[PDB]
Design goal:
The complex is a heterodimer of chains A (202) and B (8). Chain A has 202 residues and is mostly beta strands. Chain A is built from two helices and 15 strands. Chain A has helices at residues 7-13, 19-24, and strands spanning 27-32, 36-38, 45-48, 54-60, 68-74, 85-89, 96-98, 110-114, 119-122, 130-131, 147-153, 158-163, 166-172, 181-186, 192-201. In chain A, the strands form two sheets. In chain A, strands 1, 4, 6, 7, 8, 9, 10 and 14 form an eight-stranded antiparallel beta sheet that branches. Chain A has a seven-stranded antiparallel beta sheet with strand order 2-3-15-5-11-12-13. The chains are: A mainly beta (202), B little secondary structure (8).
Chain lengths: 202, 8
């Protein structure tokens, strides 16, 4: 009859890493769509050029192969547009499509949470999406707040999210033995998205 | 006033 911490709980309880370490895990300005750029004045942030009928992605500098890793995404609600997707990808995932689409999750190389739809996509050409968080009823949606956490456990092979301080449950399973990078895909002109790495265990 | 705030 007492309180036990998860490895996730313990990670969140340690003090977050220095800026130097945040920069090492930040958006890769040499691994991106041609229609986005990392801001020189704030390197935790990328900015999307106003290109019509285009979906654009960018990977984090570090592809995680082991350990638990948690980063914070800030994406202002008003700059999300029709297709705002957050997740992970292999080095082989496409970082651009024509049209407005769920680019992250539309193939075998990416796993994404569509923030507007509250739905998960992976291998979208061949497999159905899933409601997430899974407690949501078919037609029930909530607005994901501006900032939230992404939790990639390469030892369990899982991706999870934390929203408003609450664990949203496991989103994706089956990720052991991969090399997976933070990723987002976006369609909004002049949208800015921040990724701040918090900490890792192992 | 394009759907996703982009330039035609």
């Amino acid at each position: 009859d007492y309180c036990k911490p998860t490895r996730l709980d313990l990670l969140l309880d340690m003090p977050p890493v220095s800026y130097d370490v945040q920069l090492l895990h930040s958006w890769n300005n040499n691994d991106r769509s041609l229609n986005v750029f990392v801001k020189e004045d704030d390197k935790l942030i990328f900015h999307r050029h106003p290109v019509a009928q285009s979906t654009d992605a960018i990977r984090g500098k570090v592809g995680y192969t082991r350990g638990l890793h948690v980063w914070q995404i800030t994406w202002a609600m008003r700059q999300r547009g029709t297709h705002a997707v957050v997740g992970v990808a292999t080095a082989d995932a496409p970082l651009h499509s024509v049209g407005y689409t769920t680019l992250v999750g539309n193939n075998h190389e990416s796993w994404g949470w569509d923030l507007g739809r509250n739905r998960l996509y992976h291998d979208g050409k061949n497999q159905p999406s899933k409601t997430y968080p899974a407690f949501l009823e078919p037609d029930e949606t909530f607005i994901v707040p501006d900032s939230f956490l992404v939790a990639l456990d390469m030892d369990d092979g899982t991706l999870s999210f934390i929203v408003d301080g609450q664990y949203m449950g496991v989103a994706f399973r089956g990720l052991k033995g991969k090399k997976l990078y933070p990723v987002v895909s976006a369609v909004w002109g002049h949208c800015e998205i921040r990724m701040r790495y918090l900490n890792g265990l192992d | 006033n394009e759907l996703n705030n982009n330039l035609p």
